[PDB]
Amino acid sequence: EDTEADVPVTYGEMVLNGANLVTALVMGKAVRSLDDVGRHLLDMQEE
Amino acid sequence: DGTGISLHRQLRAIQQLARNVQAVLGAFERGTADQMLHVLLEKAPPLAL
């Protein structure tokens, strides 16, 4: 059952943007996608 | 590279020269006065005489 449909676009992007980049050189810390996991863990801080 | 890190450490060479260029250009104006203290004291006789 041939000729299927997959992604041609190569899989996404991780860039060290301002979430990473600030933590990158200043502390040496790096978190994959610090945006949401910073956001969500700020909001669960206020429940 | 396309990383901002490549641009970010390109910054930290510019902020190395930008302190150094003022340091050597300062050192002449500092050095300008130091010559005058030599060339006055080279032609200065001691004033007790």
UniProtKB/Swiss-Prot annotation, chain B:
Q: Coiled coil where?
A: none
Where does the source fall among the domains of life? Viruses
Q: Where in the cell is it found?
A: Virion; Host nucleus
What family name appears in the similarity comment? Belongs to the herpesviridae major capsid protein family.
- What is the annotated quaternary arrangement, including any partners? Homomultimer. Makes the hexons and eleven out of twelve pentons. Interacts with triplex proteins 1/TRX1 and 2/TRX2; adjacent capsomers are linked together in groups of three by triplexes, heterotrimeric complexes composed of one molecule of TRX1 and two molecules of TRX2. Interacts with scaffold protein; this interaction allows efficient MCP transport to the host nucleus. Interacts with capsid vertex component 2/CVC2. Interacts with the small capsomere-interacting protein/SCP.
Function comment: Self-assembles to form an icosahedral capsid with a T=16 symmetry, about 200 nm in diameter, and consisting of 150 hexons and 12 pentons (total of 162 capsomers). Hexons form the edges and faces of the capsid and are each composed of six MCP molecules. In contrast, one penton is found at each of the 12 vertices. Eleven of the pentons are MCP pentamers, while the last vertex is occupied by the portal complex.
Which protein are we looking at? Major capsid protein
Lineage of the organism: Viruses, Duplodnaviria, Heunggongvirae, Peploviricota, Herviviricetes
List the range of the whole protein covered here: 149 to 197 of 1374
